[PDB]
Design a protein. Structure first.
Lengths: 88, 275, 114, 68, 100
RNA sequence: UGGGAGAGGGUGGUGGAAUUCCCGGAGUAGCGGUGAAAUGCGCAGAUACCGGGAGGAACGCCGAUGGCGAAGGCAGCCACCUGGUCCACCCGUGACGCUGAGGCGCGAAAGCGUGGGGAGCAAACCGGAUUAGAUACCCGGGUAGUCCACGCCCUAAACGAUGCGCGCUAGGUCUCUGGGUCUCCUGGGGGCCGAAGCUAACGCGUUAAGCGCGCCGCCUGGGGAGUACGGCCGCAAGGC
């Protein structure tokens, strides 16, 4: 799975301030971490449709946060997706 | 995985080709080829003895190492996987740390860069070769000798394999590609794994032309001939067989067994093929 | 002639078959509901099994059998009466064990067991 | 006579504890019901799984013939 | 890494030379597959509940190891190639669960 | 952040019981099957028994009125990869929410395509019974199929015949799973009986079919008919 270290590294890199843990940035970053590991998982495990439902649910979650961050701060929105390789 | 064509001609509608994905080198080792003397199906009397042969693409014969107990203990690196027009398997080029180069038929799962070795002590891994008696029961295996030192005779075509089933005395029991169960001497060499290019049987030739490239001339039915030619020859209009279906030479061809009855190897065959 | 052996009671709803073997399991003699004269569904009655066990025990004792271990398979009617007949025959019943085969959920059974 | 009361402390995951696990098996070899072992739902599942591992190692049997 | 237990049953009718050779094969493989032995219990011969490979007993080994997650399946495959290894079972080490 | 339970899913491996078949041994006059029978099998040595081998499928006890999943559905055991979900802390964000025409994905069994596999079972089929007849029920055989990979099909009593979300309105009892301080209390599931209330009745009742708000789907007499025509989808069967 995803180690505890790996997750903290992601939180540090996107935290808006010292102890920040649930910012829209930190949320889109953590979901992106899971989305990309599930996508790679599903490429080999093409018949794992049940876990694929988890993917759609994640992607929809990240999408709603991104639309929120786009409505509140367009600059912060564009930088987050560019910092993560999103929107294609 | 066989490749398909769009139907931009009548023949391309169904034609399929090998994808040639394992092939990493497109020219043979010069020192390991010699001319393959085309026969047309004719013997040293000049007489056709196998009908409907000839006119296929020119080919060079690649010398294949069907012994391998030749070089016990000397490892080799799998340098390349190549096309061989003289067989359905692909062939793998081996670079021995000796410096000697030889060809083996390419097993399923072989990788260029891996090493292989032959001998009583070789690890049970794809591409290694051992006397049968040292391969664990249950292992699927190929390029099996039939008698010791006489050269690999069994399980050489694309996708085929033999399975070790048991041991009795000096002998090992194999399930040959035909499903026959056969004792084979334990000192006979085999190579672990199955032969590669397993999709060979899914090739759809597609058109008459493609058989011709392979040296297969048209086969003409006995029923299309005259009585001088064939048991099924003659009759006004179409005709059913009118007799037990026979070969051009008169022997029956629907079920009549033809293995010689008093053959010494019968003592070593346990169960005739299935299916 | 061997004096120690085995008695198998294959007892189904249609018949009861008794086979008397040696210590290694090699049959010495056998009987059944048919050998004692019955046909049809009578072969699956307890009295049938009784005559069969006695006729099997009698033959075995004719070869010097004196002691047997008893192996029982199947849940047929004449199962319990077959054990009786062996004990009350003359043979020495050293033991009785039930070895009825039972799949750990194996092959799909015929329609009539579903 | 419930089996768990006949035993002090034991580890419900010790698949090698042949001498404790074997008490949770009927004389015919079967895994005993919760009514005769005295375990709750949660621990009976651990027991059953452990017995199964021990069976695969050859410590515990899958079935025994019933002797009258 | 993760901690596992490597149960292994061997041909009980070997001699201590053949047996020490099998233990040698096993010890290298563990090392070769990145497995660091922590403890090891060797109960030896032991009557089995049922014949394994037609023998009523089996020679028992056991190692707590620490090894990387992705190599355990391959390790158990290699531990099984020898004709004398009748059984292998690599269980994820877990905490005890106690009753009473 | 720190924990839990679980037949949730995917991949590779692996265990024992049983059936059938093949070989060896031992043995003989029947076995099998039914309501009773016959077909069938058996002196060319069957059944029953012992030893060895091969092979496929399904996993006994545990197992429950149990668990998990969005539904279909999921059950030997080991490992890896992976989804959902609950709890305690009350630490971060600051309404970021609910629903959802279209779209996209999933979707039991049967069926289809290509290849593999085939022990048991078993449509079609053949035969024996039963019977007034018996294109059936019961019996003896038996091919697809059932199993695996990949691609299609997209249906159902796909049911709780009960769309999703939120708030509100006595309790009692059994149970699964967490956290307490473990008497008991408190969350989340799963049942039963019931307050008020609802309901044509049956019944429902904090797992509402009660009292309310939001949004979606759907009904408008029976037959004709889920038929025809059109269109879209499918290799076809046929689906919408
Ligand atoms: Mg999510
Ligand atoms: Mg967006
Ligand atoms: Mg390919
Ligand atoms: Mg084509
Ligand atoms: Mg093309
Ligand atoms: Mg194309
Ligand atoms: Mg055409
Ligand atoms: Mg055209
Ligand atoms: Mg090509
Ligand atoms: Mg190729
Ligand atoms: Mg030269
Ligand atoms: Mg030259
Ligand atoms: Mg030549
Ligand atoms: Mg020539
Ligand atoms: Mg000449
Ligand atoms: Mg001449
Ligand atoms: Mg010719
Ligand atoms: Mg070739
Ligand atoms: Mg080819
Ligand atoms: Mg074909
Ligand atoms: Mg073809
Ligand atoms: Mg050619
Ligand atoms: Mg031809
Ligand atoms: Mg022709
Ligand atoms: Mg003519
Ligand atoms: Mg002539
Ligand atoms: Mg003539
Ligand atoms: Mg003439
Ligand atoms: Mg003639
Ligand atoms: Mg003619
Ligand atoms: Mg004619
Ligand atoms: Mg003619
Ligand atoms: Mg005519
Ligand atoms: Mg003519
Ligand atoms: Mg003609
Ligand atoms: Mg014609
Ligand atoms: Mg004619
Ligand atoms: Mg004809
Ligand atoms: Mg004729
Ligand atoms: Mg001839
Ligand atoms: Mg020969
Ligand atoms: Mg009967
Ligand atoms: Mg082994
Ligand atoms: Mg433990
Ligand atoms: Mg957590
Ligand atoms: Mg025999
Ligand atoms: Mg005779
Ligand atoms: Mg037998
Ligand atoms: Mg049950
Ligand atoms: Mg339930
Ligand atoms: Mg649930
Ligand atoms: Mg807070
Ligand atoms: Mg604030
Ligand atoms: Mg929604
Ligand atoms: Mg929709
Ligand atoms: Mg479906
Ligand atoms: Mg199906
Ligand atoms: Mg089907
Ligand atoms: Mg059809
Ligand atoms: Mg078909
Ligand atoms: Mg099919
Ligand atoms: Mg067709
Ligand atoms: Mg097929
Ligand atoms: Mg068949
Ligand atoms: Mg009929
Ligand atoms: Mg009639
Ligand atoms: Mg009539
Ligand atoms: Mg009939
Ligand atoms: Mg039938
Ligand atoms: Mg049948
Ligand atoms: Mg058909
Ligand atoms: Mg078909
Ligand atoms: Mg639909
Ligand atoms: Mg229901
Ligand atoms: Mg529901
Ligand atoms: Mg409906
Ligand atoms: Mg209705
Ligand atoms: Mg709706
Ligand atoms: Mg409504
Ligand atoms: Mg509670
Ligand atoms: Mg508690
Ligand atoms: Mg409740
Ligand atoms: Mg009620
Ligand atoms: Mg009231
Ligand atoms: Mg109302
Ligand atoms: Mg209540
Ligand atoms: Mg209340
Ligand atoms: Mg609920
Ligand atoms: Mg209502
Ligand atoms: Mg109408
Ligand atoms: Mg329609
Ligand atoms: Mg319809
Ligand atoms: Mg139409």
């Amino acid at each position: 799975p995803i180690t505890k270290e790996e997750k903290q590294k992601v939180i540090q890199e996107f935290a808006r301030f010292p102890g920040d843990t649930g910012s829209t940035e930190v949320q889109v970053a953590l979901l992106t971490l899971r989305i990309n590991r599930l996508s790679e998982h599903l490429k080999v495990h093409k018949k794992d449709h049940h876990s694929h439902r988890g993917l759609l649910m994640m992607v929809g979650q990240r999408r709603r946060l991104l639309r929120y961050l786009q409505r509140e701060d367009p600059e912060r929105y564009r930088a987050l997706i560019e910092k993560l390789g999103i929107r294609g | 995985a066989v490749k398909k064509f769009k139907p931009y001609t009548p023949s391309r509608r169904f034609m399929t080709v090998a994808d040639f994905s394992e092939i990493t080198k497109t020219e043979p080792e010069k020192s390991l080829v010699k001319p393959l003397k085309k026969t047309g199906g004719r013997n040293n009397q000049g007489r056709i003895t196998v009908r409907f042969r000839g006119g296929g693409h020119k080919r060079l014969y690649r010398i294949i190492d069907f012994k391998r107990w030749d070089k016990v203990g000397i490892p080799a690196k799998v340098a390349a996987i190549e096309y061989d027009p003289n067989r359905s398997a692909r062939i793998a080029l081996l670079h021995y740390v000796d410096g000697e180069k030889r060809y083996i038929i390419a097993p399923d799962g072989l990788q260029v860069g891996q090493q292989v070795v032959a001998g009583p002590d070789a690890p049970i891994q794809v591409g290694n070769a051992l006397p049968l008696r040292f391969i664990p029961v249950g292992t699927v295996v190929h390029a099996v000798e039939l008698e010791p030192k006489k050269g690999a005779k069994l399980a050489r075509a694309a996708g085929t394999s033999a399975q070790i089933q048991g041991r009795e005395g000096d002998y090992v029991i194999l399930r040959l590609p035909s499903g026959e169960l056969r004792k084979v001497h334990g000192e006979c060499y085999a190579t672990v794994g199955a032969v590669g290019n397993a999709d060979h049987k899914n090739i759809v030739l597609g058109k008459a032309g493609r058989s011709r490239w392979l040296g297969r001339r048209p086969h003409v039915r006995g029923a299309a001939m005259n009585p001088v030619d064939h048991p099924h020859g003659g009759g006004e209009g179409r005709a059913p067989r009118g007799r037990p279906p026979a070969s051009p030479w008169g022997w029956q061809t629907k079920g009549l067994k033809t293995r010689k009855r008093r053959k010494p190897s019968s003592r070593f065959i346990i169960a005739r093929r299935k299916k | 002639q061997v004096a120690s052996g085995r008695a198998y009671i294959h007892a189904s709803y249609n018949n009861t078959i008794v086979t008397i073997t040696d210590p290694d399991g090699n049959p010495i003699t056998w009987s059944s509901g048919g050998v004692i004269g019955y046909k049809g569904s009578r072969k699956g009655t307890p009295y049938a099994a009784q005559l069969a066990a006695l006729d099997a025990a009698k033959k075995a004792m004719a070869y010097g059998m004196q002691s047997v271990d008893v192996i029982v398979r199947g849940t047929g009617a004449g199962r319990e009466q077959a054990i009786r007949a062996l004990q009350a025959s003359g043979l020495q019943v050293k033991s009785i064990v039930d070895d009825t085969p039972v799949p750990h959920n194996g092959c799909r059974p015929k329609k009539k067991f579903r | 006579a419930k089996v768990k009361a006949t035993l002090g402390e034991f580890d419900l995951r010790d698949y090698r504890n042949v001498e404790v696990l074997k008490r949770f098996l009927s004389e015919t070899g079967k895994i005993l019901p919760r009514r005769r072992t005295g375990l709750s739902a949660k621990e009976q599942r651990i027991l059953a799984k452990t017995i199964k591992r021990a069976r695969i190692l050859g410590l515990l049997p899958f079935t025994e013939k019933l002797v009258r | 890494m993760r901690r596992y237990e490597v149960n292994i049953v061997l041909n009980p009718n070997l001699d201590q030379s053949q047996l020490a050779l099998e233990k040698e094969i096993i010890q290298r493989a563990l090392e070769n597959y990145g497995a660091r032995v922590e403890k090891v219990e060797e109960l030896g011969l032991r009557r089995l509940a049922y014949p394994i490979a037609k023998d009523p007993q089996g020679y028992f080994l056991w190692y707590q190891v620490e090894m990387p997650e992705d190599r355990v399946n391959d390790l158990a495959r290699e531990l099984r190639i020898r004709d004398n290894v009748r059984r292998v079972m690599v269980v994820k080490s877990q905490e005890p669960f106690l009753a009473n």
